[PDB]
Amino acid sequence: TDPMVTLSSILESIINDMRDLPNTYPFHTPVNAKVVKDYYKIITRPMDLQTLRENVRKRLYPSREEFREHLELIVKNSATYNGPKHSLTQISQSMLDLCDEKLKEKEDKLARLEKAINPLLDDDDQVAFSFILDNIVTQKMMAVPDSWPFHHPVNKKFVPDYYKVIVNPMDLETIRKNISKHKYQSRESFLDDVNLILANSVKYNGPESQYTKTAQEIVNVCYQTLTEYDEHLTQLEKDICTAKEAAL
Ligand SMILES: C[C@@H]1COCCN1c1cc(C2(S(N)(=O)=O)CC2)nc(-c2ccnc3[nH]ccc23)n1
């Protein structure tokens, strides 16, 4: 019994339960951008329950976390466009709350399916590797003075032209999310994402900007810390590759 199918049935059931909450209809289908004419000038990642359900049916979500991240976009988008206390945002939050209740009820089953879909989520070398990477991000990289521009995705509401310049955005929160999902099996992919932050700062702010000097320091402290842990990380990467091959 394909665990991806079972998982998808649980996620669809959660969508059914949130669709049934009061006043949720404005979130059942995509915003009509020909009626809400400025919507895409403000919102970068539109999401709604129908798109979410179709993605569940396409087997696009191998775990709770990718599903929840897309569901959370509904709330974040409403908070940005409608307002943090707007009634619509409260309604969307009520759906995220119901999702979290249901995920809590089924966490052991969901964990088992997730491990069967991707055995690396249960591999102690992958877990230790991701733990080290997360600590580099939170304890070294986010500690660079005035690194705040790079901690979270740019909000197009506050920097309206940002995404006309930066089409491949990256930030430390997204990296932490990638780490939490165990996206990185070695330092190469992690450094691809770290360096994208710096490349985007060069492109948007300029090579001589103070923003770019800060981003350069973020990248440099990443290299310095990876070098300090090189030998353990090398052991973890070798054993992760071996686990990955055995999962075949
Ligand atoms: C564009 C600059 C330089 O490159 C990197 C991004 N960085 C940012 C990033 C962010 C956010 S966010 N969630 O606010 O969008 C924190 C994640 N905000 C601003 C901002 C917002 C309003 N007024 C501003 N004046 C000067 C800057 C500024 N700038």
Tab-separated table of C-alpha atoms and ligand atoms in Angstrom:
chain	number	residue	atom	x	y	z
A	1	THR	CA	0.000	0.000	0.000
A	2	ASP	CA	1.719	3.136	-1.388
A	3	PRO	CA	2.311	5.408	1.626
A	4	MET	CA	2.105	8.447	-0.649
A	5	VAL	CA	-1.519	7.522	-1.406
A	6	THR	CA	-2.424	7.036	2.275
A	7	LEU	CA	-0.747	10.305	3.210
A	8	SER	CA	-2.631	12.075	0.424
A	9	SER	CA	-5.935	10.686	1.721
A	10	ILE	CA	-5.222	12.031	5.225
A	11	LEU	CA	-4.274	15.457	3.842
A	12	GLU	CA	-7.399	15.590	1.679
A	13	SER	CA	-9.463	14.725	4.747
A	14	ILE	CA	-7.886	17.663	6.555
A	15	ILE	CA	-8.818	19.904	3.614
A	16	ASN	CA	-12.404	18.649	3.865
A	17	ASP	CA	-12.423	19.532	7.566
A	18	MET	CA	-11.081	23.074	7.054
A	19	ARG	CA	-13.443	23.704	4.122
A	20	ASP	CA	-16.267	23.017	6.590
A	21	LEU	CA	-15.271	25.782	9.010
A	22	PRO	CA	-17.611	28.822	9.097
A	23	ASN	CA	-17.060	31.690	6.658
A	24	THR	CA	-14.150	29.967	4.874
A	25	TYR	CA	-15.549	30.198	1.331
A	26	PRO	CA	-13.292	33.156	0.249
A	27	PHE	CA	-10.368	30.715	0.645
A	28	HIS	CA	-11.904	27.790	-1.251
A	29	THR	CA	-10.695	28.993	-4.678
A	30	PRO	CA	-7.974	31.272	-6.078
A	31	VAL	CA	-8.322	35.023	-5.708
A	32	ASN	CA	-9.750	36.420	-8.956
A	33	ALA	CA	-6.948	38.809	-9.995
A	34	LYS	CA	-9.159	40.511	-12.587
A	35	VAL	CA	-11.456	41.563	-9.752
A	36	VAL	CA	-8.683	42.144	-7.176
A	37	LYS	CA	-6.577	43.988	-9.693
A	38	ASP	CA	-3.551	44.736	-7.458
A	39	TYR	CA	-3.418	41.311	-5.829
A	40	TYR	CA	-0.286	40.074	-7.602
A	41	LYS	CA	1.457	43.398	-7.039
A	42	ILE	CA	1.228	42.629	-3.309
A	43	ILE	CA	1.144	38.802	-3.076
A	44	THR	CA	3.963	36.660	-4.415
A	45	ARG	CA	2.770	33.095	-3.662
A	46	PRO	CA	-1.024	32.811	-4.059
A	47	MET	CA	-2.624	29.783	-2.469
A	48	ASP	CA	-6.143	28.512	-1.751
A	49	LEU	CA	-7.798	25.277	-0.695
A	50	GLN	CA	-8.658	24.090	-4.224
A	51	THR	CA	-5.065	24.548	-5.416
A	52	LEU	CA	-3.916	22.828	-2.205
A	53	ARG	CA	-6.287	19.893	-2.822
A	54	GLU	CA	-5.174	19.548	-6.433
A	55	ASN	CA	-1.560	19.521	-5.277
A	56	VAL	CA	-2.386	16.828	-2.707
A	57	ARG	CA	-3.957	14.801	-5.501
A	58	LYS	CA	-0.879	15.227	-7.704
A	59	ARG	CA	1.173	13.617	-4.872
A	60	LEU	CA	3.190	16.854	-4.532
A	61	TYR	CA	3.498	16.625	-0.694
A	62	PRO	CA	5.701	13.847	0.748
A	63	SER	CA	5.208	15.042	4.364
A	64	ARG	CA	3.138	17.143	6.747
A	65	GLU	CA	5.555	20.024	6.380
A	66	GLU	CA	5.233	20.843	2.657
A	67	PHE	CA	1.477	20.653	2.960
A	68	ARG	CA	1.442	22.887	6.036
A	69	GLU	CA	3.772	25.453	4.416
A	70	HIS	CA	1.390	25.822	1.481
A	71	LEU	CA	-1.591	25.977	3.846
A	72	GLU	CA	0.164	28.664	5.915
A	73	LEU	CA	0.572	30.802	2.787
A	74	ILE	CA	-3.218	31.316	2.829
A	75	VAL	CA	-2.980	32.963	6.266
A	76	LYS	CA	0.176	34.947	5.515
A	77	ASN	CA	-1.271	36.233	2.229
A	78	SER	CA	-4.483	37.317	3.936
A	79	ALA	CA	-2.522	39.020	6.736
A	80	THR	CA	-0.497	40.978	4.159
A	81	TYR	CA	-3.336	41.902	1.826
A	82	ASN	CA	-6.353	42.124	4.145
A	83	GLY	CA	-4.578	42.848	7.440
A	84	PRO	CA	-3.428	40.890	10.505
A	85	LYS	CA	-6.703	41.394	12.372
A	86	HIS	CA	-8.995	41.393	9.367
A	87	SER	CA	-11.870	38.972	9.732
A	88	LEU	CA	-10.632	37.077	6.655
A	89	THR	CA	-7.251	36.482	8.293
A	90	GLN	CA	-8.955	35.213	11.456
A	91	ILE	CA	-10.976	32.773	9.315
A	92	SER	CA	-7.839	31.521	7.543
A	93	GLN	CA	-6.116	31.144	10.924
A	94	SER	CA	-9.035	29.042	12.101
A	95	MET	CA	-8.293	26.669	9.224
A	96	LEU	CA	-4.591	26.483	10.065
A	97	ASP	CA	-5.566	25.763	13.699
A	98	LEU	CA	-7.857	22.919	12.655
A	99	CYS	CA	-5.104	21.487	10.476
A	100	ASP	CA	-2.682	21.537	13.398
A	101	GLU	CA	-5.218	19.781	15.643
A	102	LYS	CA	-5.704	17.035	13.058
A	103	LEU	CA	-1.961	16.663	12.461
A	104	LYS	CA	-1.482	16.300	16.221
A	105	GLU	CA	-4.105	13.538	16.411
A	106	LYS	CA	-2.425	11.536	13.610
A	107	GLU	CA	1.246	12.363	14.228
A	108	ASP	CA	2.460	8.793	14.808
A	109	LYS	CA	0.742	7.422	11.692
A	110	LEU	CA	1.905	10.424	9.683
A	111	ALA	CA	5.465	9.939	10.954
A	112	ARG	CA	5.373	6.306	9.841
A	113	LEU	CA	4.115	7.158	6.365
A	114	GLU	CA	6.671	9.955	6.032
A	115	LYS	CA	9.491	7.588	6.988
A	116	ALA	CA	8.228	5.026	4.480
A	117	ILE	CA	8.070	7.671	1.753
A	118	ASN	CA	11.552	9.020	2.550
A	119	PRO	CA	13.637	6.801	4.873
A	120	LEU	CA	16.234	9.561	5.255
A	121	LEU	CA	13.848	11.458	7.543
A	122	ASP	CA	14.513	8.688	10.077
A	123	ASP	CA	18.274	8.395	9.449
A	124	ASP	CA	20.362	9.576	12.411
A	125	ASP	CA	23.204	10.837	10.219
A	126	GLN	CA	20.819	12.982	8.161
A	127	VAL	CA	19.231	14.258	11.383
A	128	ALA	CA	22.608	15.144	12.934
A	129	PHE	CA	23.749	16.822	9.706
A	130	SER	CA	20.599	18.963	9.538
A	131	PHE	CA	20.945	19.797	13.234
A	132	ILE	CA	24.474	21.116	12.663
A	133	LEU	CA	23.392	23.153	9.625
A	134	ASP	CA	20.485	24.669	11.570
A	135	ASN	CA	22.818	25.663	14.374
A	136	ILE	CA	25.173	27.346	11.914
A	137	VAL	CA	22.211	29.318	10.579
A	138	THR	CA	20.738	30.358	13.952
A	139	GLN	CA	23.879	30.748	16.073
A	140	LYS	CA	26.407	32.086	13.573
A	141	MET	CA	24.707	33.421	10.435
A	142	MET	CA	21.663	35.038	11.988
A	143	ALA	CA	24.010	36.537	14.613
A	144	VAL	CA	25.833	38.707	12.067
A	145	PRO	CA	25.109	42.328	13.088
A	146	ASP	CA	22.346	43.982	11.061
A	147	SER	CA	21.647	40.726	9.199
A	148	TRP	CA	17.878	41.344	9.516
A	149	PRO	CA	17.292	42.049	5.759
A	150	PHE	CA	18.270	38.432	5.079
A	151	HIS	CA	16.382	36.598	7.847
A	152	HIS	CA	13.045	36.288	6.049
A	153	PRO	CA	11.646	36.536	2.515
A	154	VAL	CA	11.146	40.101	1.298
A	155	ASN	CA	7.503	41.166	1.589
A	156	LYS	CA	6.472	42.581	-1.780
A	157	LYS	CA	4.036	44.870	0.051
A	158	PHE	CA	7.019	46.667	1.629
A	159	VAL	CA	9.518	46.441	-1.271
A	160	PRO	CA	7.229	46.543	-4.320
A	161	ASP	CA	9.927	46.164	-6.991
A	162	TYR	CA	12.009	43.506	-5.220
A	163	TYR	CA	10.736	40.536	-7.203
A	164	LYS	CA	10.977	42.351	-10.554
A	165	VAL	CA	14.747	42.318	-9.922
A	166	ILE	CA	15.156	39.115	-7.877
A	167	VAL	CA	13.469	36.143	-9.568
A	168	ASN	CA	15.345	33.439	-7.591
A	169	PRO	CA	14.944	34.757	-4.013
A	170	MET	CA	16.552	33.137	-0.970
A	171	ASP	CA	16.745	33.929	2.742
A	172	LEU	CA	17.794	32.332	6.003
A	173	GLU	CA	14.263	31.358	7.050
A	174	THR	CA	13.728	29.469	3.798
A	175	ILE	CA	17.055	27.725	4.364
A	176	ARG	CA	15.933	26.748	7.865
A	177	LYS	CA	12.731	25.359	6.364
A	178	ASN	CA	14.769	23.404	3.802
A	179	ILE	CA	16.965	22.073	6.638
A	180	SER	CA	13.910	21.110	8.672
A	181	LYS	CA	12.680	19.084	5.682
A	182	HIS	CA	16.194	17.533	5.359
A	183	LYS	CA	16.559	18.937	1.830
A	184	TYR	CA	20.352	19.063	2.163
A	185	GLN	CA	22.362	15.839	2.035
A	186	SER	CA	25.708	17.652	1.816
A	187	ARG	CA	27.334	21.068	2.023
A	188	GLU	CA	27.155	21.719	-1.737
A	189	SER	CA	23.372	22.190	-1.913
A	190	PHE	CA	23.303	24.143	1.347
A	191	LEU	CA	26.007	26.464	-0.024
A	192	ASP	CA	24.090	26.869	-3.279
A	193	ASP	CA	21.265	28.372	-1.249
A	194	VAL	CA	23.542	30.393	1.070
A	195	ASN	CA	25.372	31.925	-1.886
A	196	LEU	CA	22.070	32.780	-3.613
A	197	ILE	CA	21.390	35.247	-0.754
A	198	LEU	CA	24.664	37.026	-1.500
A	199	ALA	CA	24.213	36.965	-5.279
A	200	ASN	CA	20.755	38.514	-4.868
A	201	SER	CA	22.158	41.212	-2.613
A	202	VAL	CA	24.807	42.056	-5.216
A	203	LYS	CA	22.099	42.210	-7.891
A	204	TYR	CA	19.479	44.200	-6.009
A	205	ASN	CA	21.602	46.476	-3.779
A	206	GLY	CA	24.898	46.614	-5.634
A	207	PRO	CA	28.359	45.194	-5.017
A	208	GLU	CA	29.406	48.061	-2.730
A	209	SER	CA	26.201	48.296	-0.688
A	210	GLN	CA	26.271	47.895	3.094
A	211	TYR	CA	23.581	45.235	2.570
A	212	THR	CA	26.056	43.267	0.474
A	213	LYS	CA	28.866	43.683	3.034
A	214	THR	CA	26.500	42.183	5.613
A	215	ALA	CA	25.561	39.333	3.245
A	216	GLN	CA	29.257	38.727	2.553
A	217	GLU	CA	29.826	38.408	6.296
A	218	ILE	CA	26.931	35.920	6.545
A	219	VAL	CA	28.484	33.802	3.791
A	220	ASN	CA	31.972	34.099	5.318
A	221	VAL	CA	30.869	33.016	8.785
A	222	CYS	CA	29.103	30.083	7.107
A	223	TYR	CA	32.376	29.008	5.460
A	224	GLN	CA	34.360	29.559	8.679
A	225	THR	CA	31.976	27.373	10.684
A	226	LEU	CA	31.681	24.618	8.071
A	227	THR	CA	35.482	24.485	8.055
A	228	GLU	CA	35.572	24.166	11.843
A	229	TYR	CA	33.221	21.143	11.651
A	230	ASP	CA	34.691	19.760	8.407
A	231	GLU	CA	35.669	16.345	9.726
A	232	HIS	CA	32.375	15.471	11.422
A	233	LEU	CA	30.423	16.859	8.474
A	234	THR	CA	32.512	14.718	6.119
A	235	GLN	CA	31.640	11.649	8.186
A	236	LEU	CA	27.966	12.569	8.158
A	237	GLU	CA	27.968	13.178	4.400
A	238	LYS	CA	29.649	9.838	3.670
A	239	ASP	CA	27.191	7.942	5.852
A	240	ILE	CA	24.194	9.842	4.423
A	241	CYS	CA	25.270	8.934	0.886
A	242	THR	CA	25.571	5.283	1.962
A	243	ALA	CA	22.096	5.344	3.539
A	244	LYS	CA	20.737	7.023	0.408
A	245	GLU	CA	22.191	4.281	-1.818
A	246	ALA	CA	20.887	1.518	0.429
A	247	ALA	CA	17.406	3.044	0.146
A	248	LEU	CA	17.340	1.667	-3.405
B	1	LIG	C1	15.579	45.198	0.080
B	1	LIG	C2	16.521	45.187	1.310
B	1	LIG	C3	17.962	44.980	0.839
B	1	LIG	O1	18.139	43.725	0.255
B	1	LIG	C4	17.726	42.648	1.047
B	1	LIG	C5	16.308	42.843	1.570
B	1	LIG	N1	16.126	44.131	2.263
B	1	LIG	C6	14.877	44.286	3.036
B	1	LIG	C7	14.255	43.151	3.564
B	1	LIG	C8	13.068	43.329	4.285
B	1	LIG	C9	12.333	42.089	4.856
B	1	LIG	S1	10.514	42.401	4.841
B	1	LIG	N2	9.593	41.140	5.537
B	1	LIG	O2	10.177	43.711	5.422
B	1	LIG	O3	10.106	42.640	3.441
B	1	LIG	C10	12.915	41.817	6.244
B	1	LIG	C11	12.640	40.654	5.282
B	1	LIG	N3	12.581	44.548	4.430
B	1	LIG	C12	13.231	45.608	3.908
B	1	LIG	C13	12.649	47.014	4.026
B	1	LIG	C14	11.252	47.194	4.201
B	1	LIG	C15	10.709	48.481	4.268
B	1	LIG	N4	11.506	49.527	4.140
B	1	LIG	C16	12.863	49.396	3.939
B	1	LIG	N5	13.838	50.359	3.792
B	1	LIG	C17	15.035	49.766	3.617
B	1	LIG	C18	14.858	48.389	3.658
B	1	LIG	C19	13.468	48.158	3.862
B	1	LIG	N6	14.340	45.484	3.213
